[model samples]
Target: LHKEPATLIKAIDGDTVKLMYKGQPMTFRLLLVDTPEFNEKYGPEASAFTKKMVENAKKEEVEFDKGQRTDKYGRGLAYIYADGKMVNEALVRQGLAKVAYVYKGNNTHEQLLRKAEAQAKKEKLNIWS
Candidate 1:
């Protein structure tokens, strides 16, 4: 992932966000994590969680990292850092999301995210509970 300064344009859902990554506008999907749909169970809460994280990023001028490629729809896979934490891992660890999709290439934080998912499950966090 190459780091790029970004401004949060909006949170599209629990795992998707819109941002201006180093001056280019793009859609970014959180890498290696999935959350409930905005209309499904726990969906609103998950979305709110994501919005809050992005808001924090906007306030903090956080740097967002993007993968080398894009998804089929042209959205970039990204990792957002805000308040000293990785937002993708934060969502899973806090129980708002789970590890769902695998990128076709290397995912730098896959192991850490899997561990976070397991711990959240064992603790019966928001999504698991």
Candidate 2:
């Protein structure tokens, strides 16, 4: 796994963002999390939450998973960090996203993510409620 500094161009949604990485513009899908689509319940809230996090961050980076770098749609699959906090885990902790799309051998930080999801579930936040 490797991480590269990135600049936030836009927060497309709760789990997707457009960023400038390595001097090139790219779209990234946050690894291990699935947020509501724009038409789904809590979708706007999730988007807003992500936007706030990324926009307010003084530093941003994308950590590529050990396995595949890009999804079928060509979006980079990574763990996003905003000023050192893992955005993927934050989303799960906030109940704005669910841990999903995990594949065998590509489970970096899976335990930590699951723990955050459990906390959100216990609190019945957002999608959990």
Candidate 3:
């Protein structure tokens, strides 16, 4: 089902990426969480790291679970799945992202994100100034 091809055209910060697919302007949020700013510690590393990761993920189509319509910024929010693993969990568990502050009733990913963040903090990964 993921044999289709799409191009990742731009990186919007460390957590967002813009894509041009079939002449459509689409943006994807790095599922599960948000990382620090580029100027902040581990910010540039995280951002650059994410770009490389997504750029290399061309062969893997991100499976999505659309729970809501769109954000106030007019962006769609969907849970991403790749290789039978939820991308949200992967990123958050690695301390690359924090909880996305979803307002919906679905709190499934919240606990996992917290646990990941805690682990990152304990390990002193980008937690200090």
Candidate 4:
């Protein structure tokens, strides 16, 4: 986002991250996705993958596209970008995540991600294997 209050900081887990935005430190809840639990077998791997992607992000500044806007728990719903590509979509492509659609057709990156996930599943990539 060109505006303030946005960051692509370290991902504490596959689905949770700390963002210092608008002068506030907030934990963001990823939208349209539910990854493995933090303690699950694939959890650390997923978290590491996410962290690696986000490591390139600059301080409190990131490209963010709001999706659901707010989740049930009041966390911000957004698609994060790194190196000009959607990080969320990358996770789906790697089969590290699924399209946890909260509302159908609401995901901006769904089409590409679906195909990516399909390919990953077919190839026995990360998750489907």
Candidate 5:
């Protein structure tokens, strides 16, 4: 799928962020992974980590794929990127979130994510810890 260019404006939480696309404000929920709720255990930590990951990126222009942009909650669903890395996958691999949702065309990506989660679980990393 073709990816769109965006700039990370702010991170709302572990899996949600505010971005700028063509100078317009766009909010997106990172696809596949789900972190703790804002009020739940480790929620703040997840957010903090997510914020660091995005803000500390080497560049501001991140890429995104929005095949199915919106979800039932009216929020845009996307795979966020930074320096060519998928941020959603990073969160799962780091164990800050879990692979909780699957979408069309998610085969290889999902497989990689599940393997990352399994490794995280086995190592008791982050959320698994």
Candidate 6:
């Protein structure tokens, strides 16, 4: 996995974020995770969690999948890391997001994410409830 350092500009939502990458501002969607939309149930909580995590992290980075770099919308798809921890998996562990949008060759963290999702489901947290 290739890790690229980035600066968090803002959390757009639970699964989307604005970041400064390579001295340019870009929008990125968290890969392999789906969270509620802003108008959906528990959406606010999910967004809040993402915002808090990014804002509080001492370091932020992005790791793109080898198969695809961007989605149809041109938003970069990646696994976001905050303070050395995978925020994408963290969201699933907290039940704020689900393991989703999986692709055949881009499953860098699929097993870890599935484990987190299973734990969340068992605990009945947020979306799992």
Per-candidate local distance difference test: 0.78, 0.93, 0.59, 0.68, 0.78, 0.93
Clashes of each: 0, 0, 2, 3, 0, 0
| Candidate 5 residue-wise lDDT, 8-89, digit = tens | 7888998998888778887788778899988998789889888998888765444334355667776667777777777888
lDDT of 4 by residue, 3-106 (tens): 33466545788866777666666777665666787788677777888788777755333334443555677666666665566667777778788778656545
- Which residue ranges in model 5 land beyond 4 Å of their true spot? 60-67, 105-108
Q: For residues 1-129, what per-residue lDDT tens digits would candidate 2 score against the true structure? A: 666799999889999999999999999999899999988999999999999999999999999878888889999999999998899999999999999999876679899999999999999999999
Residue 81, candidate 4: alpha-carbon lDDT:
64
Q: List the pairs of residues colliding in candidate 3.
A: 33-98, 34-98
TM-score per candidate, chains pooled: 0.87, 0.97, 0.69, 0.80, 0.85, 0.97
Q: In model 4, how large is the Cα lDDT of residue 45?
A: 76
- Error (Å) of candidate 1 at residue 79 is 1.1
Model 1: C-alpha RMSD to truth? 2.3
CA lDDT, candidate 3, residue 88:
62
Q: What is the lDDT of residue 57 in candidate 3?
A: 66
Clashing pairs for model 5 are none
The ten-residue window of minimal lDDT in model 6 covers 65-74
- Alpha-carbon RMSD to native, per candidate: 2.3, 0.9, 3.7, 2.9, 2.2, 0.8
Global CA lDDT computed for model 1: 0.78
Query: What TM-score does candidate 5 reach?
Result: 0.85
Where does candidate 6 clash, by residue pair? none
Runs in model 2 lying further than 4 Å from the true structure: none
Worst 10 residues of 1 by lDDT: 58-67
* 14-120: candidate 1 lDDT, tens digit per residue: 88888777688888888888999999887998899988887866342333333455688988777777655788888999888988787655477888999999999
How far residue 49's Cα lies from its native spot in candidate 2, in Å, is 0.7
What's the residue-level lDDT of 7 in candidate 4? 67
Model 4 RMSD vs true structure: 2.9
